[PDB]
Specification:
This is part of a larger assembly, with 7 protein chains of 7 kinds. Chain D has 7 helices and 2 strands; from the N terminus they run ααααββααα. By secondary structure, chain D is mostly helical. Classes of the chains: A mainly alpha (41), B mainly alpha (154), C alpha+beta (48), D mainly alpha (180), E alpha+beta (98), F mainly alpha (128), G alpha+beta (138). Chain B binds one RNA strand of 322 nucleotides through helix 1, helix 2, helix 3, strand 1 and strand 2.
RNA sequence: AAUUCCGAUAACGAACGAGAUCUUAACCUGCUAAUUAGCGGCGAGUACACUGUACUUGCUGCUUCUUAGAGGAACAUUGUGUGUCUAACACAAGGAAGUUUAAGGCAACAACAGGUCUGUGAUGUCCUUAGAUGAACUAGGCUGCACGCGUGCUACACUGAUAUAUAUAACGAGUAAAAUAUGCUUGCAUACUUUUCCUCCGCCGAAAGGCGUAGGUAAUCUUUAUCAAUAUAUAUCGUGAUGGGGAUAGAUUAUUGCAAUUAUUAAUCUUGAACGAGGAAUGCCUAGUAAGCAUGAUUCAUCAGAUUGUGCUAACUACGUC
């Protein structure tokens, strides 16, 4: 069951693991951090 | 990503010398920006084809459809509406019944083709049976293709 | 009488007058059992 | 000279149980830039040895129900899995794979009195165990397959109970030891 | 002339005979044009009735078409062809000025 | 914020707005999507960022949607054979109308009504 | 001058035209990179990497691919480039050099030189598959 | 592989079957051939470079590739092991090909009271024949449903769904009724047109679909240097019976037909059931197969979840034992 939320390795799973976030929110964090699967920075 | 090292000599003289998607997205974006071709308003309430069985759900798609059609016209120089309907066909889950491919909606296609034709990009003729590409469009497509190739490459 | 010029009762085997099992491919109009009796002389030979 | 995906060197190995190096057979004529070589592998019994060990891993990984024949996605998953491996731990991925096969294979088993496991069979069983472990992990489980495959390869290479393959090998080896 | 048949060997015999016949008289033929073979295939259930295993046999009627375009007076080439054919070979007119 | 209850439950709030909108009626999704675009609540956001005014606008659009650009064919509950002509009638009213139609069928009598009253499917499943 | 040859894997056919030029390579009207799957891309670049970049710099290559699906086309292209390079050196360049080149290609793989001849086993009645059967039950 | 051979041997010699024959598919003849196939030759432009590349209209040596005729090619060839060292096998090499190259087709003797007179004007006898079991017309029904058993289809999601984009397939298959005018009176009767099959294409239609036209009796037009879907790439969800799942129902406008209600079929909106990988049991399968994904054809006035073909995507595991 979900218990992940809005607010407080660059894979979506790693971000979800570290900060306890849903994977769309994990993606949102990745996009913020940076500034299907593909080559990494 | 888009750039990779190459072991042969590229030409960069045509749409045939550049990948479909980058050319298509940029041309679609440019077309909307310029405002040459309309949305049109009724087009937001309908689907691309019956294999979708859902809203198109992506906003800027009409310009993309036009952009792909225009590219297809350079690729294949004489075609009509049926070719487009067949091109944009995909699979339809019929619920319990098996899948079949199902043709794209012909009004939206017919309208795009007509708007391009009005703007001098494409041309209905008897010498070559259907729609072909025509000269203002041919020059523009070729030139825009060069402009993109240089801009992307370095 | 009230025939129809379409559907199952409209047609029948050229040789035997059975209404069932008729080959209409290539417009043969023969039922398959009858077709097996004739299949060599018509030219529809077996091979593979 | 030649390199896997342009990324992994393949000029270095450890010697394993010696048998396994002969079987897995990473060498110049078995090297190729990418997985996907569909040459005749069912010519005779031994022929599986000549089939590249990476090629074998992709073929096994592609296997299961809905995912059958979708070989390019399976290849994509292994390429990403090696890239994940390279970042997550300090070694060359090609080496990590060699370590996983060297640890991973079960060496003894029972049909009626345990008997020794042949080395070609041991390699196949290890590859199967690694992929089956990845599959068991993957289903409904949120974490992506490339990462899940990567976790099995590193854990097997390490030797751990966070690998299915080592656990299964332990189970096989114990039952055989106990029976016999 | 255009030659259509369901006998390969008969068509072949006709082909050689008109080829020899023409070449005596120096006539212009454009060398035997073999058209793609068309087969009429019928896929037939065995047994007139259902019982026993479902067993099918696949029938093939293979038709041969061959083509020669020719510049000459019609009458001699058709007369040479028509007398030399076996009736299993169906002959159709084709003619050119070069 | 999050955890809203509208006409019916809509507790969606980490969830995307459009799917949250589906959770009433318009689970067919097209109706919900066109209403969302016409209302002009934006699909991008999560449902905990809905404005109350935007929700009211959605009710306004949903109410008789012929007057926007939403097509008559696209609209549900069309001819509804009577002297009048109708529109999609939403939620418990929609259920009430469906129930009403079944009640009318039982009085009217023909085979579909009779099968329905009996408890037997419309097209047949082939119960053999 | 020019030589023309082919490659054939499954129902694909890829014609290779090897002419005097500069190192320009097209696939129908379109440049060589534009074939899509990145993994199988490397397979078609593979003969260029085995032979270095100098040998193609004297020659322009044109390719026409018809028939077969995705995997089949890639192998047919790979095969056709092989057959093309070696055949051009036998008519025009030098037989010893060609033999050396052929040795390099053969030493890597025979699949490049001569296509795999596997093709379909026909469907046979009594089941959807080629050999597979309907489920029997008692 | 084989009462296949060898070998032994009161039998020696045979014959049918089997192999063999035949049809495909597999490779080579720079020989045989060019149409409704390609390839160049060459004029001409449109586009870009830069001392060719891309793209369209007109004329016209080459045959590698498209097609299809004839003919070649493997016999276990050579080498190495095992084998009465006999028939032969095993391995390696060579080779387009090495399990008689892969697949089919064909089907001995003797049977079964197996199946079929609901395929037949093949057919015995027995029944029936104007209140017919003949011919024929109208409805109803074969599909109904406390419930039991088969074969398939569709699922149970993230190696996924949803939405855009890109790539790309093979076998094929295609021609006594319709409509306009006149006489009688929209009814009836007659003439004339050119009507039923594939639909390109142009217009109109959300979609279904429509209208207008054009070529095709077909390597020529539908249509094929491209008609599929799994491909793959980029986005959107983010594991939650969830946006999975599409059963079920409700409302529509179309389309075929004399007739669509027991919803023929079609689309459109809405409606959102079981189902968390399946007990006991039991099926199929060894290489371009299995699986997955499609699609052509057969029936067809209309109706594929069927059958039969055909491809694409290309695994696992041996390679044996009773």
């Amino acid at each position: 069951k979900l218990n992940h939320a809005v607010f407080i390795v660059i894979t979506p799973s790693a971000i979800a693991e570290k900060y306890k976030v849903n994977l769309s929110v994990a993606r949102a964090v990745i996009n913020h951090l940076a500034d299907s699967q593909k080559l990494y920075t | 990503r888009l750039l990779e090292p190459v072991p042969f000599v590229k030409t960069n003289n045509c749409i045939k010398d550049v990948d479909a998607d980058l050319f298509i997205r940029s041309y679609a974006t440019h077309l909307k920006l310029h405002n040459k071709i309309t949305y049109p308003k009724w087009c937001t309430f309908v689907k691309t084809g019956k294999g979708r069985k859902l809203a198109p759900l992506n906003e800027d798609w009409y310009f993309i459809r036009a952009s792909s059609i225009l590219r297809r016209l350079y690729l294949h120089p004489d075609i009509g509406v049926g070719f487009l309907r067949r091109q944009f066909s995909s699979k339809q889950r019929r619920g319990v019944a098996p899948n079949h491919t199902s043709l794209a909606s012909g009004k939206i296609l017919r309208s795009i083709l007509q708007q391009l034709e009005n703007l001098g990009y494409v041309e209905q003729n008897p010498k070559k049976k259907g729609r072909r590409l025509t000269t203002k469009g041919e020059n523009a497509i070729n030139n825009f293709a060069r402009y993109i190739n240089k801009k992307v490459y370095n | 009488v009230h025939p129809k010029k379409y559907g199952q009762g409209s047609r029948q085997c050229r040789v035997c007058s059975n209404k069932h099992a008729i080959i209409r491919k290539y417009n043969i109009n023969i039922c398959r059992q009858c077709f097996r009796e004739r299949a060599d002389i018509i030219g529809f030979k077996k091979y593979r | 000279d030649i390199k896997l995906f342009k990324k992994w060197s393949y000029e270095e190995i450890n010697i394993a149980d010696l048998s396994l190096v002969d079987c897995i057979a990473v060498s110049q004529k078995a090297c190729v830039y990418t997985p996907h070589t569909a040459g005749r592998y069912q010519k005779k019994r031994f022929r599986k040895a000549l089939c590249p060990i990476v090629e074998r891993l992709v073929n096994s990984m592609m296997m299961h129900g809905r995912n059958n024949g979708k070989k390019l996605k399976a290849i994509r998953i292994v390429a990403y899995a090696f890239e994940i491996i390279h970042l997550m731990t300090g070694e060359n991925p090609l080496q990590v794979f060699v370590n996983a096969v060297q640890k991973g294979g079960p060496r003894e088993d029972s049909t009626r009195q345990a008997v020794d496991v042949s080395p070609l069979r041991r390699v196949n069983q290890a590859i199967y165990l690694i992929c089956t472990g990845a599959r068991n992990a993957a289903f409904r489980n949120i974490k992506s397959i490339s990462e899940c495959l990567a976790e099995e390869i590193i854990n097997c290479a390490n030797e751990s109970s966070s690998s299915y393959a080592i656990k299964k090998k332990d189970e096989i080896e114990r039952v055989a030891k106990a029976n016999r | 002339i255009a030659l259509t048949s369901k006998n390969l060997r008969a068509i072949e015999k006709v082909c050689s005979d008109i080829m020899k016949g023409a070449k005596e008289k120096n006539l212009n033929v454009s060398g035997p044009v073999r058209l793609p073979v068309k087969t009429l295939r019928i896929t037939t259930r065995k047994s007139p009735c259902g019982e026993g295993t479902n067993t099918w046999d696949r029938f093939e009627l293979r038709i041969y078409k061959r083509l020669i375009d020719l510049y000459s007076q019609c009458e001699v080439v058709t007369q040479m062809t028509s007398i030399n054919i076996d009736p299993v070979v169906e002959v159709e007119v084709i003619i050119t000025d070069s | 914020q999050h955890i809203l209850r509208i006409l019916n439950t809509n507790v969606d709030g980490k969830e995307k707005v459009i799917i949250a909108l589906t959770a009433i009626k318009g689970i067919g999704k097209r109706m919900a999507t066109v209403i969302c675009k016409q209302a002009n609540v934006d699909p991008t956001k999560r449902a905990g960022e809905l404005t109350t005014e935007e929700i009211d606008n959605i009710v306004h659009i949903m109410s008789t949607p012929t007057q926007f650009k939403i097509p008559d064919w696209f609209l549900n509950r069309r001819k509804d054979l009577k002297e009048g002509k109708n529109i999609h009638v939403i939620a418990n009213q929609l259920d009430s109308y469906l129930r009403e139609d079944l009640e009318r069928m039982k009085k009217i009598r023909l085979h579909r009504g009779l099968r329905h009253h009996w408890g037997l499917r419309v097209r047949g499943q082939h119960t053999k | 001058k020019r030589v023309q040859t082919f490659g054939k894997k499954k129902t694909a056919v890829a014609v290779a035209t090897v002419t005097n030029g500069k190192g320009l390579i097209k696939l129908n009207g379109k440049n060589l990179d534009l074939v899509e799957p990145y993994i199988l891309k490397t397979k078609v670049y593979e003969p260029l990497w085995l032979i270095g970049s100098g040998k193609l710099k004297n020659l322009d290559i044109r390719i026409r691919v018809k028939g077969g699906g995705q995997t089949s086309q890639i192998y047919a292209i790979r095969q056709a480039i092989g057959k093309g390079i070696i055949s051009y050196y036998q008519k025009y360049v030098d037989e010893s050099t060609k033999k050396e080149l052929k040795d390099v290609l053969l030493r890597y793989d025979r699949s490049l030189l001569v296509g795999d001849t596997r093709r379909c086993e026909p469907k046979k009645f009594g089941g959807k598959g080629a050999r597979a059967r309907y489920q029997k039950s008692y």
